[PDB]
């Protein structure tokens, strides 16, 4: 319900009733080498359950509240990294990117935790990339404050591969759809080889998303990709 | 006015009141060597003035008349090829592939001109690709009749690069935007290079569309592309 979701999300944003979940992202050659943990937002509904980002993000956007989540989540993430030595990754939404106020606030916050710059990567989903202009300032600002930037769910937008060279990303997360059952339909290899060849040529490591299978894993590994992540390595779970 | 166009096209379509224009498609490494000529449709209006396909095609679509153009153009093109020995290229519209009747008529026509098979390439623009099934049903069909198929305005669907080898297409015409001012905007090279790497591996020659500039030509040529077309080599003109 537009107003069930509306009361719930507004209250949740205000009391900061969001939980941090994590999923390990690991080296392809060694699934015991942890590259970072990808932070996932979980919503606490009063009638019990933990609700996944996938279920609530759609409404956050419909209400234009996404930037609030972003702020909340970044403050929480930075806070919680004080407890360990692990590298983390977290999304930024197009909404934050579009509001100069929100975006400044974010830089404000990063400047306050400059110590953590080398342990937190910020991520944008392909489906909400801003202009290459915006991406360029974004990385300049971030690099100055010691933080790295990455892109994810790539790439329907593969034609921008060369634009990315000038951005010095930490890595590129490939949409899992491009590796789904790859071991089973070698059809999909040509495209992956292309990304892998191009990206390697500008020193940008590739991470394969949503790997569900040993078969999928063994081909990704073999084609020479750097990282993997997915249900093969477990459900997203609270800090451990 | 939407009204004026309805009557013009229906009338001109009925009267077969169209002119074939041509634009040469030429080797990247020798712009004097003509790979083939692309047939361009030109509407004659009431005063004998020509209207380019670019302007009138959107209306054939709205009025659902593209299959009419297709049949009329195909017949004329097959007719005029009898007067020379040059190779030609001609678009089929999605509307035809989707109309089983129109499509069989197209096959009946082709079948009636087996002898021209090796000199006529049919083209589908990327914007109007049918589903993979239709593409392959179409490829086996033309093949048995001697005719070959190609794709144009390509680049946005590079992720389908793996599905292309089983088609034995004649060539891939790369959409001009991936080429535009490539000599200034060198961001564009990595994508092109990637397309050319995959195209080499499936033995599918590339042709760059709408090349306007010696700088573009020079870059395209250096990257190994087979062919080029565009205003650099002159405007579209009647056979003469
Ligand atoms: N089919 C399949 N799915 C898998 C597999 N492995 C993990 N997943 C799921 O797909 C999403 C993966 O995380 P993500 O790539 O960061 O994708 C994320 C991320 O891009 C975004 N998101 C999550 N948290 C935040 C946040 O705090 N802020 C922003 N702006 N976006 C967020 O929404 C997505 C999260 O949705 P989730 O519901 O948490 O769902 C997660 C996860 O539950 C797999 O092997 N197969
Ligand atoms: N800016 C720029 N433009 C250039 C350049 N070189 C050529 N052009 C123009 O772009 C189009 C090129 O032909 P096309 O790629 O086959 O693209 C064609 C073709 O796909 C299609 N078309 C034309 N005739 C037919 C037809 O008889 N049947 C069907 N189904 N489609 C047709 O519509 C397009 C033709 O529209 P046109 O008005 O003829 O416009 C032509 C041409 O005038 C350049 O260097 N720069």
Numbering used by the authors:
A (entry chain B), B (entry chain A): 409 to 648
Give the exact sentences the study uses for this entry.
Here, we elucidated the molecular mechanism underlying the function and regulation of P. fluorescens LapD, a transmembrane receptor essential for biofilm formation in this strain. Here, we present three crystal structures of LapD from P. fluorescens that provide models for the c-di-GMP-unbound cytoplasmic domain lacking only the HAMP domain, a c-di-GMP-bound EAL domain dimer, and the periplasmic domain.
We obtained crystals in two independent conditions, yielding two different crystal forms (space group C2221, two molecules per asymmetric unit; and space group P6522, one molecule per asymmetric unit). Most importantly, dimerization of the c-di-GMP-bound EAL domains is incompatible with the conformation observed in the crystals of apo-LapDdual. The surface occupied by the S helix overlaps significantly with the homodimerization interface, which indicates that dinucleotide-induced conformational changes will include the displacement of the GGDEF domain and the S helix.
